[model samples]
Target: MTSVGVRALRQQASELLRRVEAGETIEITDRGRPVALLSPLPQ
Candidate 1:
């Protein structure tokens, strides 16, 4: 699992997506709180 802020996530979307494609999970946060989750889908 990885935690990333909204702005950073926006700035590094492609890289983050690559991580997800590799089966990692991402937590998107705002003000240090979680607001969304990005994870790989079932194969």
Candidate 2:
């Protein structure tokens, strides 16, 4: 898994989604605290 800050996530959302679709699990953080996750759906 990889961690991405909220601001960076906003800026690179498209690229991030591409990575997620490619099966990467990404952790979204707000102010250095984890808030959510972006991950591919199970096949």
Candidate 3:
């Protein structure tokens, strides 16, 4: 599992997406609070 803040994720959108696509779970945060989750969708 991995975590990233809003600004960091915004700046690194492509890289973060690449990581998620590679099967990583990312927790997206705003002001240190979790706001969203990104993961590979089941097929």
Candidate 4:
């Protein structure tokens, strides 16, 4: 699992999504608080 800020996530959206697609779980944060999650769907 990993965590990223809103701005960083926006800047690296494609790369991040690619990681998620590859089965990594990412936590999206706003103002240092967790707001959303990015992860791959079950097969």
Candidate 5:
């Protein structure tokens, strides 16, 4: 598995979001605990 830290991730947020719009799911963690999830916006 691969891990991407928050600091580096913020920079790519927009692109990450675009992918989600294309049907991707993103899992965000904080302090090793799951914090948030983003998926394609509701139709």
Candidate 6:
């Protein structure tokens, strides 16, 4: 697992989104709190 802030996520949303589609899980943190997560659909 890794930690990324809102601005960094916003800076790379497109690539991150594509990665999620390609089966990568992305987790986001905000102000030391977890906000959102993206996971690929089960195969």
Give TM per candidate.
0.86, 0.86, 0.86, 0.86, 0.68, 0.69
Candidate 6 backbone collisions, by pair: none
Ordered from best to worst lDDT, the candidate numbers read 1, 4, 2, 3, 6, 5
Worst 10 residues of 5 by lDDT: 1-10
Off by over 4 Å in 6: none
lDDT of 6 by residue, 1-43 (tens): 4556798798988888888888888789999788988888876
Please estimate how well model 5 matches the true structure, expressed as its whole-model Cα lDDT: 0.70
- What ranges in model 5 sit over 4 Å off? 1-4
Error of 3 at 9 (Å): 1.0
For model 2, residues 1-43, the per-residue Cα lDDT tens digits are 3899988898999999999999899999989999999989986
Judging by lDDT, tell me the better candidate of 2 and 4: 4
| Candidate 4 segments exceeding 4 Å error | none
13: Cα error in model 2, Å: 0.3
**lDDT of candidate 5 over 1-43, digit per residue (tens):** 1333576468887877777888888777777776777778789
- Give candidate 1 misplaced runs (Cα > 4 Å): none
- Alpha carbon lDDT of residue 32, candidate 4? 94
Q: How much is the lDDT of residue 42 in candidate 5? A: 86
Alpha-carbon RMSD, candidate 6: 2.2
lDDT of each residue in 1-43, candidate 3, tens digit only: 2889988987999999899888898999989999999989876
**Position 24, candidate 3: lDDT:** 91
Ranked by lDDT, the better of candidates 2 and 5 is 2
Number of the candidate with higher TM-score, 4 or 5: 4
**RMSD (Å) per prediction:** 1.6, 1.8, 1.6, 1.7, 2.5, 2.2
How high a TM-score does candidate 1 get?
0.86
